[PDB]
Structures are given as structure tokens and as C-alpha cells.
Specification:
This protein is α+β, with helices and mostly antiparallel strands. Helices cover 32% and strands 25% of the residues. The protein contains 7 helices and 12 strands. Strand 7 (204-209) and strand 8 (213-217) form a beta hairpin. It binds 1-(3-phenylprop-2-yn-1-yl)piperidine. Interacts (via FERM domain) with CADM1. Interacts (via FERM domain) with PRMT3; the interaction is direct and inhibits the protein-arginine N-methyltransferase activity of PRMT3. Interacts with PRMT5. Interacts with PRMT6. One of its GO terms (cellular component) is cell junction.
């Protein structure tokens, strides 16, 4: 039996290495990573790889790894796939812990925009979880944390983290992680997967996919939101992605909103993440 070496970037930035038989389905590797992580609530998570076009793709657990990575390296990342709208309802603290690590990266990367005060509050809960109670000894007026808190660090933000960290004395890691998630879950881009597209008139928009439904970001004004109940069906053809929307009750016919994606692959990728998120919605 011939086995391929797999390298997986974990949410703490460490690398897990294992082998799978070369015709292995994605689930085989995913099970090995989750066992390494002591993770039972596996449904929220997945592995990504980078394609020949360098786009992040989800590794489909039901398909051969080799028919997805194709010409590319067997290099993957471990990631949150379905962000729980209410993380307090997860059964295990360790689930919440990996969700916090993912969200920290969402924040530092700028995928999850955040006010100054929310960056400092989230950062203060991370410090409480990682270092425990505030200690003046490892913190003068000139202190800068090793922790990455934001896409752009300022001394003002470092000071605000320390100020809020002082208020969390006696908080356990599980408690701090739960506070982190109660704040993060409210942010308007929490759990939103963004895709570049053009509307039917050729104007550049972003489509967001999340637990609640689909968002069309025309700009900061003119955000269109379709709760999953309103979304009839979703399809792709060539470079095109089509959303059918239920009529208002007493209306005869659904509406169709069409979008142009960069290429056929970007259209199929959006379709798949939409179908996967809708099935998530129906199981809540
Ligand atoms: C959204 C949405 C949405 C809301 C209504 C219809 C379609 C999409 C994103 N938001 C993140 C914070 C928690 C609530 C869900």
C-alpha cells in the first residue's frame, strides 16, 4: 500500500505530519487531524488546500484527496468551516478553544473587521486565557504583547488590552474563551465567507455566505440580505452563479439574481459553499 505524506497547518500555527494511503478520501486525513487535536465536535471544521490558481478550496471529505490537490503539494490547513451562531451551545470547551484560535486569525488577517474597543476586549480575553491573571512584573508602561491582536498594532491598542486584562482577575481559560466568543459572534462579518463577483450590470460586488443566509455587499450602503428561507435554489453555469428568491406571498413567480464570477472554478466553489451552508441552516 503506497502512502503520501500530508502536512497540516494547525490553528496554533504548528505543523502536523502524517501519512495516508494515496487513494484516501479527505475524511481519512481529517479524522487523523481531529484525533491529534482531541476534537469530537468535528462537524464545524474542515481542511483547506491551495489550488493551481492559488485559491483556498475546502477538501471534500467524500472525494479522493489526489483528485482535489491534483498537481499540487499535499499541504493543508485546519480551519473552521461552519461558524456556530451561538458558540455557548457547543458541548466542549476544546471546540470553543479552536473556534477562538480561528477567530484570532480572522481578526489579525482583517477578514473580520473590528472596532478599536472590540479589538482590545477580544485581545484582553485572549491574554487572560493564555497568561492568566494580570501581572505588573511582565508589563511596564512600555509593554508590547507577543500576541497579535489586530491587522495593525498601535501602542494605544496594547495599553487598552492591558487596562481590560486588569479587570479579568480570577477568570479561567474556558471563561475568558466564552467571553471572547460572546463578543466575536456579534460582529457583522462573523462567520461570513466573502466571494468577489459582478452583478448582472457588470458592477463589482461581494457575496457573503454565512449561517443566516446570503449577503450582497453593493457597498457600505445597499447591503441586500436573503435569509435561507427566502433562497429557493442556487446554481452555476460557466462563469455564472444564479440565486432564485421566493416571491412575496401572493406573488406568482420567484425572482432570479445573476452574478458573474472570475472563472468557472470560482462559480462552482461559491455554489458548493452555499449548498453546504444551506444544509447547515436546515439542521439548526
Ligand atoms: C449575517 C447575516 C444575514 C442576516 C439575515 C439574512 C441574511 C444574512 C451575518 N451575521 C453575523 C453576526 C451574527 C448574525 C449573522
Amino acid at each position: 500500500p503506497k502512502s503520501m505524506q500530508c502536512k497540516v497547518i494547525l490553528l496554533d500555527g504548528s505543523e502536523y505530519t502524517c501519512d495516508v494511503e494515496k487513494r484516501s478520501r479527505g475524511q481519512v486525513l481529517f479524522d487523523k487531524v481531529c484525533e491529534h487535536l482531541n476534537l469530537l465536535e468535528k462537524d464545524y471544521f474542515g481542511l483547506t488546500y491551495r489550488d493551481a490558481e492559488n485559491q483556498k478550496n475546502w477538501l471534500d471529505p467524500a472525494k479522493e484527496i489526489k483528485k482535489q490537490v491534483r498537481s499540487g503539494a499535499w499541504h493543508f490547513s485546519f480551519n473552521v468551516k461552519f461558524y456556530p451562531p451561538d458558540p455557548a451551545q457547543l458541548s466542549e470547551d476544546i471546540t470553543r478553544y479552536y473556534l477562538c484560535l480561528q477567530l484570532r486569525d480572522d481578526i489579525v488577517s482583517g477578514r473580520l473587521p473590528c472596532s478599536f474597543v472590540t479589538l482590545a476586549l477580544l485581545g484582553s480575553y485572549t491574554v487572560q486565557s493564555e497568561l492568566g491573571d494580570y501581572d505588573p512584573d511582565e508589563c511596564g508602561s512600555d509593554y508590547i504583547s507577543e500576541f497579535r491582536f489586530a491587522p495593525n498594532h498601535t501602542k494605544e491598542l496594547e495599553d487598552k488590552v492591558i487596562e481590560l486584562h486588569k479587570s479579568h482577575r480570577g477568570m479561567t481559560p474556558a471563561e475568558a474563551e466564552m467571553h471572547f466568543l460572546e463578543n466575536a459572534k456579534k460582529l457583522s462579518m462573523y462567520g461570513v465567507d466573502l466571494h468577489h463577483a459582478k452583478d448582472s450590470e457588470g458592477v463589482e460586488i461581494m457575496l457573503g455566505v454565512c449561517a443566516s443566509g446570503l449577503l450582497i455587499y453593493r457597498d457600505r450602503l445597499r447591503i441586500n440580505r436573503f435569509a435561507w428561507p427566502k433562497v429557493l435554489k442556487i446554481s452555476y453555469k460557466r462563469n455564472n452563479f444564479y440565486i432564485k428568491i421566493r416571491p412575496g406571498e401572493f406573488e406568482q413567480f420567484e425572482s432570479t439574481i445573476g452574478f458573474k464570477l472570475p472563472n468557472h472554478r470560482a462559480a462552482k466553489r461559491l455554489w458548493k459553499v452555499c449548498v453546504e451552508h444551506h444544509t447547515f441552516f436546515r439542521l439548526l
